[PDB]
Structure formats: C-alpha cells, structure tokens
Scaffold this motif. Sequence first.
Motif, PDB file in Angstrom:
ATOM      1  N   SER A 169       0.827  -1.196   0.000  1.00 29.81           N
ATOM      2  CA  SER A 169       0.000   0.000   0.000  1.00 29.81           C
ATOM      3  C   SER A 169       0.870   1.257   0.000  1.00 29.81           C
ATOM      4  O   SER A 169       0.633   2.179  -0.779  1.00 29.81           O
ATOM      5  N   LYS A 170       1.897   1.270   0.853  1.00 35.09           N
ATOM      6  CA  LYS A 170       2.843   2.370   0.932  1.00 35.09           C
ATOM      7  C   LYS A 170       3.562   2.546  -0.408  1.00 35.09           C
ATOM      8  O   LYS A 170       3.528   3.634  -0.979  1.00 35.09           O
ATOM      9  N   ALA A 171       4.189   1.488  -0.933  1.00 36.72           N
ATOM     10  CA  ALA A 171       4.895   1.558  -2.209  1.00 36.72           C
ATOM     11  C   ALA A 171       3.987   2.026  -3.342  1.00 36.72           C
ATOM     12  O   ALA A 171       4.372   2.821  -4.200  1.00 36.72           O
ATOM     13  N   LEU A 172       2.752   1.553  -3.289  1.00 32.92           N
ATOM     14  CA  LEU A 172       1.666   1.883  -4.193  1.00 32.92           C
ATOM     15  C   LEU A 172       0.886   3.094  -3.685  1.00 32.92           C
ATOM     16  O   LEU A 172      -0.290   3.223  -4.018  1.00 32.92           O
ATOM     17  N   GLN A 173       1.515   3.989  -2.918  1.00 34.90           N
ATOM     18  CA  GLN A 173       1.016   5.320  -2.594  1.00 34.90           C
ATOM     19  C   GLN A 173      -0.472   5.324  -2.216  1.00 34.90           C
ATOM     20  O   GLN A 173      -1.274   6.014  -2.855  1.00 34.90           O
ATOM     21  N   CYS A 174      -0.853   4.531  -1.211  1.00 36.28           N
ATOM     22  CA  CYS A 174      -2.228   4.429  -0.732  1.00 36.28           C
ATOM     23  C   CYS A 174      -2.272   3.747   0.637  1.00 36.28           C
ATOM     24  O   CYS A 174      -1.247   3.305   1.159  1.00 36.28           O
ATOM     25  N   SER A 175      -3.466   3.702   1.228  1.00 40.13           N
ATOM     26  CA  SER A 175      -3.796   3.013   2.462  1.00 40.13           C
ATOM     27  C   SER A 175      -4.274   1.589   2.136  1.00 40.13           C
ATOM     28  O   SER A 175      -4.789   1.366   1.039  1.00 40.13           O
TER      29      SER A 175
END
Length: 76
Positions: free
Chosen positions: A54-60
């Motif tokens: 989620s972090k790497a993919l810029q989201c929660s």
Amino acid sequence: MNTQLMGERIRARRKKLKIRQAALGKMVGVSNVAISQWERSETEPNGENLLALSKALQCSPDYLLKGDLSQTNVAY
C-alpha cells in the motif's frame, strides 16, 4: 461478480503510478516474482507486506481491502 481482486488492484495502481514491477518489488521489499504471483493472484500479501505494498503503491490498505481504484463500475 467479484468485489475486485487484490492482484488487479495492484496491476492497476502500479500502472496508474507507472512503477516497473521490479522497482515495486524493491520498494515493497520482495522479489519481482512475488509481485508477479500477487498480481497473477496466486499468492496474497499478508498484513505487513500488504501495508508495504500500500505504501509503495502510494495508498492506504483500505484502498485494496475495498477497491478505491475509480468511483464507478462496482465501485472499482
């Protein structure tokens, strides 16, 4: 049918962000192949790796639990 697949959420997020699969692997801290298996929906990421995704993919994680990929079409 379905309520979106984690793997296609990844495949979608990742292209939307324009991240190469190997780079995503490095960002999350997995081998490229693990990303491949995740998107191909063989394996599923667990809590820590899901957060890292989620972090790497810029989201929660919320995004991938629910599907926050657009705002129409089975709330994609």
